Design a protein around this nucleic acid. Structure first.
Lengths: 116, 94, 73, 98, 166, 204, 158, 163
RNA sequence: AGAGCAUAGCUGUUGGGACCCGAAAGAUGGUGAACCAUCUAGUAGCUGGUUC
RNA sequence: AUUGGAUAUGCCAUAUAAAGCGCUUUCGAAGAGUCGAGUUGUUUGCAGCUCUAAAUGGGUGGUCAUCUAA
RNA sequence: UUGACCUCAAAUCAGGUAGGACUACGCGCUGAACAAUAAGCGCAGGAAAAGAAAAUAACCAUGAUUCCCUCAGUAACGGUGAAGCGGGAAAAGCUCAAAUUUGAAAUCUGGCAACAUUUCUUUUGUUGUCCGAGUUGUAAUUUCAA
């Protein structure tokens, strides 16, 4: 049982081509969703900062975005992560606020029945 | 904290009937405190343990032999050993 | 202090009783539903009020024959 | 400019927040209704054959063997302790009612 | 309302009510064929909570398997092979005795338009789910092959991945 | 009542969750050489040790054993006395299972063993206490069930480097042969109560 | 090699060819017509998003971005938008305003039923004690609450 | 063969005379058949369409989960249990719950009779909660009759191991 | 008052079918004691050979 | 020619309706021959057999943390 | 009695569906040599399986699964031999059971009638009515993140 990496330049170009069709389908929105900033859970890397999965419910409510719409404007949700330190709430709320600063939202046509 | 006063009281309270005979109490003491300086050396450790064990066993066996039932187990007694018959055979082979 | 006493059953050495109503012997004086009563059980049903509306839909557009149309038909 | 800046650190200043309660942690609370439901069914289904014999031992007052029997049948003391407390609750209630 | 009460009456399987039913039901089931249709589930609340809904296309078959591979996992393979067209949803214990285990197995008709048009049970019409009792993709199949999250739950070892630049 | 046919010394063998293949073998060895050992079912509780007192009364075992398996490699041993008594922590390593080739001895089953204790036990107060406790534990009482009146076992306990080397030695008609029980035994702490209370001695 | 591959190689039937290989050609843009018009057909999406004033990824680039030329107390605060660095972003933003401008009438009128429904309540229980008028049941057939009655009162105005 | 008292109840059903009197009352409060309910609704749809206050419906309540929750609220004045439910497990607790909540109840004969009351093939249980003021005095008669022919009668026979 | 790290080569060594050829196999599964196919590059201190 | 997701715009909308956030002097159901134990096979889990549970419980880790199976 | 309801059957009763083939990849059962190994058997797809924690961890804590790189030939075992961590690819979340719609089974297959519709006279629907399914519970509702 042996594996060869001859398709390594083939697979990389397939991935790039897979990104370009995604960009074609969804033009204005970025090819990647926003991710939060979290700290690795170990004494070795705890002083580091990296990306998370999504923004917890305290990070959404504090920033001012409901949890239902957040999934629609590209902000992802992590029901499992929680905020134990306020610096973790702060680094990710401002991460949301800077995102909503640059976020153009296209209006959608809405059904308007004659009566009500 | 190693409370010696508490330990001494506990040991004295939990002291067993040492007044009984050595064979009766089934308790002995090491001949030379099992002095094995070469802990790493298996041969030295076994020999020191053997010397302490043999002297204690001989004294207990002599006391038991002089007091009713002898400590030594005769081959006449067909009682099962601590290990199984296959285990005893395996022990003999090994 | 257990005295090291050994039980006599140690491993080392009416088929049809009558119905015992120990729980239903006394009648409970309150319900179990602690939840408050909703509005549905006091307002006209919204199930038919929805069905009525789409029946008016079908009547207005002629989808279904009307009651007077049914009699003459 | 939305941009993640990883590495080094972001901050050593810490402030713990008293975390709320998660509702999945709430599992295992005794609902007031379901206690009644469990009790009523316990009365209806009767008692297990081994568990019936536990009642007689308690009535005969050989509680030591009652623990031994339940432990043997169930598997651990806390499982046996709860059953005995479950059984003795039946016995006292039947004796006061009847 | 009721399936709360049926939940805890089924938790005591040696009580007199159940044991008297265990004898009565097992005697009459052995009188039948090995695999036979059942109109209403012998355990309505268990069938309910396992996915069964009282509507057309939902089927139940009762099977006895000799005691002495899993028994319940067997009941699913034998029922599915019997009803070749139905997709097996689930399975549950209904009864047992000294010589047999009686299992009920729920199946779905992939062709019935009550099912095909059901937004929630549509997933079973897809061919990837053909005979999930045969691949080990049911609940007991997932358990019997040790699939799950945990620390208590091959070719990645033997392979020699030689990268392009090595 | 309290009990029928009371014999002074009894052993309560019990291991917590996570016991492995090797630790299982020595539980079999301990239940073998000790006739009146009351083998029991595992505990769902890995640190609820004070519940042993309720179990101790149940089986009326004056001495209690606990085979803890921390992280599937740390083999802990806990020994105590049923009425309060010194609950002493231990750590045991480098064991000899009965399947090992090191064993070539042959001793009777249930025979009263000869207890040999090093003088270093009496040097320290805590070491003397554990020596007496081990004397009560290993010492098979007279009239023990499933035992023999003969003597074919000698236990040697040597203290060095802060830990005890235990060896089981068989008397031969001395030209002794090791039965096979052999390990390294270390003391951790001693409790004034039965799996509870403040710690009186803490080994470093 | 295989039998199935080899019998149709010897036979006279033409091979089911497909001239599909168009290497190096990117996916043409559909969706937003504005960006499509300003989409260079040769540049990569990381290059085109940048040239168009859009972020391809708000998350850190995991690599080395091209250097073509030698380049020389707050939770309540809100970030006052981000001015567009390109015309094309302003084109996208301008359309967002106009689309919202068309969809400005979010107030709903009333149908006949709720119209006379609100008059019957209003002329009997004034116009301020909405809780009391929700407490009545003879006219409050549907048993509306105070909150929804006020909404109908506002909606009936225009 | 010997039978638990939990199942022995269902052998001692309601008498012929009383059961008829229960059904005579119930027949006044049968639920509307789906046919005329369509006709009744279409009358209101027509009234709404051309141009335009009712009263509470008064019927019997049916369904195993529906009836259990009416008892658990003590909203049930009278519970009627079919003696031959297919898996007897379904109502073996109902006499216990009906006694625990003080709801008078009777084990009537056959389930198809109850089904005919509610325009269904089979009805495993029926419950009378609200009765119009005209028959309020009438209902209290059968509750006493059930209390006389089911609770005063049997009672001890409800506890004996049947068979 | 640190001298390594990385690449390429050479020779050496340990595995891998392991310089090439050669010992009855055995096992699984089939066909009508026999026979077939694969696992198999099963096994060697030995034999014969190993190229300007 | 055949289709796909968007835009633009015409018509029809059964809306007496349906949602999100908010506040709660009212509530909050949670998967059993399963977990678990002894024991026996298989290769730690899995399987048979013997028993067989609980409701701040139960599993797992370090009196705590995390998780919420059938 | 009638006749309901339950079971029992049959029919060339209508509408269906299953089998065999392929097997590189894939999911199971099972298996000896020389090792979950060949084989044997069973079941599938354009991928299969897995999957939104009865998951780690002891941290400033992380956050479905899958694959890659490292962790690492490390721990552990006794040569066999991992997993968190970290870094990448990709990302998406959800539906039931357990609630009385009870001021109204609100749910659905099938027959028939017209209306449509098409990769299509070969597809797939709607409206109306009738009959069944269903109250031993089909819709809405709610799934712990609540």
């Amino acid at each position: 049982y042996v594996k060869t990496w001859f398709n390594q330049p083939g697979r990389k170009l397939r991935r790039r081509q897979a990104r370009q069709t995604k960009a074609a389908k969804i033009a204005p929105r970025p090819v990647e969703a926003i991710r939060p900033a979290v700290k690795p859970p170990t004494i070795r890397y705890n002083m580091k900062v990296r990306a998370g999965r999504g923004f917890t419910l305290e990070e959404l409510k504090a920033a001012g975005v409901s949890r239902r719409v957040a999934s629609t404007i590209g902000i992802p949700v992590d029901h499992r992560r929680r905020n134990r330190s306020e610096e973790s709430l702060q680094r990710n709320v401002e991460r949301i606020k800077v995102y909503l600063a640059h976020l153009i939202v296209f209006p959608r046509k809405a059904g308007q029945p004659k009566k009500g | 904290i190693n409370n010696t006063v508490a330990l001494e009281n506990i040991y004295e309270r939990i002291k067993y009937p040492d007044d009984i005979s050595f064979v009766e109490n089934q308790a002995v003491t090491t001949k030379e405190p099992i002095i094995i300086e070469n802990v790493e050396d298996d041969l030295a450790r076994e020999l020191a343990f053997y010397k302490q064990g043999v002297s204690s066993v001989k004294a207990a066996f002599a006391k038991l032999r002089e007091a009713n039932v002898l400590i030594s187990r005769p081959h006449d007694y067909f009682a099962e050993m601590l290990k199984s018959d296959d285990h005893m055979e395996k022990v003999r082979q090994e | 202090e257990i005295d090291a006493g050994y039980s006599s059953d140690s491993s080392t050495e009416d088929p049809y009783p009558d119905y015992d109503d120990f729980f239903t012997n006394t009648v409970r004086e309150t319900p179990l539903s602690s939840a408050p009563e909703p509005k549905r059980r006091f307002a006209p049903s919204k199930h038919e009020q929805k069905r009525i509306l789409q029946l008016a839909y079908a009547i207005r557009k002629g989808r279904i024959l009307t009651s007077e149309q049914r009699a003459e038909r | 400019a939305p941009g993640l800046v990883v590495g080094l650190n972001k901050g050593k200043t810490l402030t713990k927040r008293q975390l709320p309660e998660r509702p999945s942690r709430r599992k295992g609370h005794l609902s007031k209704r379901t206690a009644f439901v469990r009790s009523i069914v316990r009365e209806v289904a009767g008692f297990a054959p081994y568990e019936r014999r536990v009642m007689e031992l308690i009535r005969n007052s050989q509680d030591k063997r009652a623990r031994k029997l339940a432990k043997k049948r169930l598997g651990t003391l806390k499982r046996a302790k709860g059953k005995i407390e479950e059984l003795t609750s039946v016995i006292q209630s039947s004796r006061l009612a009847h | 309302g009721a399936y709360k009460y049926l939940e805890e009456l089924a938790k005591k399987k040696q009580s007199d009510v159940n044991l008297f039913l265990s004898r009565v039901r097992a005697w009459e089931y052995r009188q039948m064929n090995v695999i036979h249709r059942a109109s209403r589930p012998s355990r309505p609340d268990k069938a309910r909570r396992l996915g069964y809904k009282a509507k057309q296309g939902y089927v139940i078959y009762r099977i006895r398997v000799r005691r002495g591979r899993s028994a319940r996992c067997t009941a699913e393979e034998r029922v599915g092979r019997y009803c070749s067209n139905l997709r097996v949803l689930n399975s549950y214990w209904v009864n047992q005795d000294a010589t047999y285990k009686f299992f009920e197995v729920i199946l779905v008709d992939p062709s019935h338009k009550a099912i095909r048009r059901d937004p929630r049970i549509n997933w079973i019409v897809n061919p990837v789910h053909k005979h999930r009792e045969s691949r080990g993709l049911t609940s007991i199949g997932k358990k019997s092959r040790g699939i799950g999250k945990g620390h208590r739950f091959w070719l990645r070892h033997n392979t020699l991945s030689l990268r392009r630049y090595r | 009542s309290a009990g029928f046919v009371p014999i002074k010394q009894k052993v309560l063998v019990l291991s917590s969750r996570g016991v492995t293949y090797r630790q299982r073998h020595l539980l079999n060895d301990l239940v073998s050489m000790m006739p009146h050992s009351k083998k029991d079912s595992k505990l769902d509780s890995k640190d609820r040790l004070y519940q042993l007192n309720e179990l101790a009364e149940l089986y009326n075992c004056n001495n209690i054993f606990f085979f803890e398996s921390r992280r599937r490699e740390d083999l802990y041993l806990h020994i105590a006395r049923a009425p309060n008594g010194p609950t002493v922590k231990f750590h045991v390593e480098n064991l000899h299972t009965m399947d090992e080739l090191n064993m070539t001895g042959n001793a009777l089953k249930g025979s009263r063993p000869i207890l040999s204790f090093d003088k270093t036990f009496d040097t320290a107060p805590h070491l003397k206490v554990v020596k007496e406790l081990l004397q009560q534990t290993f010492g098979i009482p007279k009239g023990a069930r499933r035992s023999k009146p003969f003597i074919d076992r000698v236990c040697t306990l040597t203290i060095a480097d802060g830990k005890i080397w235990f060896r089981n030695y068989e008397i031969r008609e001395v030209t002794l042969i090791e039965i096979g029980p052999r390990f390294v035994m270390t003391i951790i702490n001693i409790l004034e109560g039965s799996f509870g209370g403040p710690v009186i001695y803490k080994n470093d | 090699a295989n039998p199935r591959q080899r019998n149709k190689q010897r036979s006279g039937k033409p091979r089911l060819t497909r001239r599909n290989a168009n290497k190096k050609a990117k996916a043409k843009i559909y969706g937003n017509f504005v960006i499509q018009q300003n989409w260079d057909k040769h540049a990569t999406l990381r290059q085109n998003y940048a040239r168009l004033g859009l972020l391809a990824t708000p998350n850190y680039v995991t690599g080395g971005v091209e250097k073509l030329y030698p380049d020389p107390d707050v939770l309540d605060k809100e970030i006052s938008i981000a001015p567009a660095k390109t015309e094309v972003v302003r084109q996208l933003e301008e359309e967002a305003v106009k689309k919202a401008a068309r969809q400005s009438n979010k107030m709903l009128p009333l149908s006949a039923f709720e119209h006379a429904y609100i008059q019957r309540l209003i002329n009997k229980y004034g116009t301020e004690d909405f809780e009391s008028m929700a407490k009545d049941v003879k006219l409050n057939s549907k048993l509306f609450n105070g909150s929804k009655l006020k909404n109908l009162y506002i909606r009936m105005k225009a | 063969l010997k039978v638990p008292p939990a199942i022995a109840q269902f052998q001692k059903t309601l008498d012929k005379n009383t059961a008829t009197q229960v059904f005579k009352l119930l027949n006044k409060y049968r639920p509307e058949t789906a046919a005329e309910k369509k006709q009744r609704l279409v009358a209101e749809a027509e009234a709404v369409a051309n141009g335009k206050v009712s009263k509470k419906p008064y019927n019997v309540k049916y369904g195993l989960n529906h009836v259990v929750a009416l008892i658990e609220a003590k909203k049930a004045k009278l519970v009627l249990i079919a003696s031959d439910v297919d898996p007897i497990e379904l109502v073996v607790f109902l006499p216990a719950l009906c006694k625990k909540m003080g709801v008078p109840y009777a084990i009537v004969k056959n389930k198809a009779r109850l089904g005919t009351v509610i325009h269904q093939k089979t009805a495993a249980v029926l419950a009378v909660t609200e009765v119009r003021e005209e028959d309020k005095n009438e209902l209290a008669s059968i509750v006493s009759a059930v209390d006389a022919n089911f609770s005063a009668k049997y009672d001890e026979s409800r506890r004996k191991w049947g068979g």
